[PDB]
UniProtKB/Swiss-Prot annotation:
It is a peripheral membrane protein. NCBIfam families: small_GTP. GO terms for biological process: autophagosome assembly; bone resorption; early endosome to late endosome transport; endosome to lysosome transport; endosome to plasma membrane protein transport; epidermal growth factor catabolic process; establishment of vesicle localization; intracellular transport. The small GTPases Rab are key regulators of intracellular membrane trafficking, from the formation of transport vesicles to their fusion with membranes. Rabs cycle between an inactive GDP-bound form and an active GTP-bound form that is able to recruit to membranes different sets of downstream effectors directly responsible for vesicle formation, movement, tethering and fusion. In its active state, RAB7A binds to a variety of effector proteins playing a key role in the regulation of endo-lysosomal trafficking. The lineage of its organism: Eukaryota, Metazoa, Chordata, Craniata, Vertebrata. The keyword Lipid metabolism applies. The keyword Ubl conjugation applies. It is found in: Cytoplasmic vesicle, Phagosome membrane; Late endosome membrane; Lysosome membrane; Melanosome membrane. This is Ras-related protein Rab-7a.
Amino acid sequence: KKVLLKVIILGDSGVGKTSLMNQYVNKKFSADFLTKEVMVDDRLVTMQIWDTSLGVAFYRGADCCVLVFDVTAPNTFKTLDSWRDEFLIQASPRDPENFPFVVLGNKIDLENRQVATKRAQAWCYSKNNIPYFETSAKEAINVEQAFQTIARNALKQETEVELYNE
Ligand SMILES: Nc1nc2c(ncn2[C@@H]2O[C@H](COP(=O)(O)OP(=O)(O)O)[C@@H](O)[C@H]2O)c(=O)[nH]1
Ligand SMILES: [Mg+2]
C-alpha cells in the first residue's frame, strides 16, 4: 500500500495559489493537480496538490485544506471565514475543529503589506490553532517550510482515515 495525500488550495483569485503550487513543486515562478514525493520524518508520501462547482467528492477526499490570502489585500483576508466554512460544508469532516487547515499569507515580498501578521495569527489561533505561514511564491520565501507542514498534517489526517477506516 502506498501513501497518497490529497491537498486542495482555496482562496480569492489573484492571491497566489497557482504560483505557490508551482514554486513548491517545480521551483519556478511565472480542476487540475501536481504531484510531489515528499519525506515526512522517515516516511515517503506522494502529495497530490489540487488547484482551484467542483462537486462534493472533490472536497470530501481532501487530507488538508490550504487557505491563501494576499497580505497586501485586506479583502482576501476577510473572505477566509467564507472559504473555511464552505470547505466544511462541502467536505463534511467528522471532527470539524480538528480537520487540518493551513493558512498562507502570501506576497510578503511586497513591503507595503496591509494585513498585520498578528491579526492573521489571531484569526488562525481562534479556529483551534490553525498553522499559519507567511510566504512569497515570487521569491521562494517559506514555501518549502509551509508545504512540509502541509504534508505532515495531511499525513496525520490520512493516517486517521486509514486506521479507523473513516
Ligand atoms: N509579488 C508577488 N506576486 C505574486 C506572488 N505570488 C503570486 N504573485 C502574482 O500575483 C498574480 C496572481 O497569482 P496567481 O498565482 O495566478 O494566483 P491565483 O489566481 O490565486 O491562482 C500573478 O500576477 C503572480 O505573478 C508573490 O509571492 N509575490
Ligand atoms: Mg490560479
